[PDB]
Amino acid sequence: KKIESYLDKLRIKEKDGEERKIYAEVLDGRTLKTLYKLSAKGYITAMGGVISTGKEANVFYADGVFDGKPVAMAVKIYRIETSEFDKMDEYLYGDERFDMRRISPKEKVFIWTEKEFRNLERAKEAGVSVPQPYTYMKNVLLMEFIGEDELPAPTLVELGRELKELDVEGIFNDVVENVKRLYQEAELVHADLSEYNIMYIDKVYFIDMGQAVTLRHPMAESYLERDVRNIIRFFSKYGVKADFEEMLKEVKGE
Numbered sequence: 001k002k003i004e005s006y007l008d009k010l011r012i013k014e015k016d017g018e019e020r021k022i023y024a025e026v027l028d029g030r031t032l033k034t035l036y037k038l039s040a041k042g043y044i045t046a047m048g049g050v051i052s053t054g055k056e057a058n059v060f061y062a063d064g065v066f067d068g069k070p071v072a073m074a075v076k077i078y079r080i081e082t083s084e085f086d087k088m089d090e091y092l093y094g095d096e097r098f099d100m101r102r103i104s105p106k107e108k109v110f111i112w113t114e115k116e117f118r119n120l121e122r123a124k125e126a127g128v129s130v131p132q133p134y135t136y137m138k139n140v141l142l143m144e145f146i147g148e149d150e151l152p153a154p155t156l157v158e159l160g161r162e163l164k165e166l167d168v169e170g171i172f173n174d175v176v177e178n179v180k181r182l183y184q185e186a187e188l189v190h191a192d193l194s195e196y197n198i199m200y201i202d203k204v205y206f207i208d209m210g211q212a213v214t215l216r217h218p219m220a221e222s223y224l225e226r227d228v229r230n231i232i233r234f235f236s237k238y239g240v241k242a243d244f245e246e247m248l249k250e251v252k253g254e
């Protein structure tokens with residue numbers, strides 16, 4: 001009559017039936033040990049509810065500790081099961097921080113995770129508005145929780161019409177400025193920047209930096225142009241009048 005898993009070694013607050021069920025479903029044996037280890041080392045204080053679900057990754061809330069202070073965290077967990085070809089691998093093209101000549105393809109997800117963490121660091125250093133990275137281990141990344149009282153900040157697409165009551169032109173400009181810093185200082189380009197991965201509290205936040213490439217990537221320039229078109233498409237719907245070439249110039253500084 002053996003226990004099924006070691007799930008109960010995790011501190012999960014409001015651990016009733018359904019919360020545990022969710023955790024049991026998404027956590028494999030390896031990830032569980034990792035979460036346990038991050039807890040034992042002091043980073044994770046208690047795990048909370050699901051924040052987002054996805055193909056490549058799931059994100060949960062946690063209370064935690066970083067640099068001697070309590071923090072609210074997003075705990076991003078990359079799914080460990082990986083296919084022989086993922087676009088995440090292609091996103092590594094030309095990134096000198098990583099050479100897959102020293103990794104086993106069964107552990108590439110750890111590289112995706114590290115890359116996202118290092119992108120967050122690089123972005124934050126360049127003054128781009130992104131969650132502060134805290135630490136990472138295996139397929140787990142811990143970063144600043146964007147929002148308040150365990151409610152994640154609304155994405156642009158969630159705000160929708162509401163953007164008109166918060167100076168929508170100012171918000172567009174805030175978006176552009178961040179793309180500019182990301183391009184000129186971080187030398188990064190988001191592969192698919194849109195209303196779906198930009199959050200807003202009292203300023204914009206770019207919240208998924210794993211889907212990014214360095215300027216050495218063959219598609220870096222196309223991704224950038226498409227990003228600009230994405231932004232223009234979206235913000236025009238709310239009355240913002242902007243020109244493609246102007247903002248592309250503004251980001252790149254010709």
Ligand SMILES: N#C/C(=C\c1ccncc1)C(=O)NCc1ccccc1
Pocket residue numbers: 051052054056057058059074076131143144145146147152153207208209
């Ligand atoms: N990254 C990211 C997320 C989605 C995502 C995209 C692409 N792949 C996997 C997950 C996300 O919802 N994060 C929630 C969050 C992050 C940071 C602070 C507060 C709340």
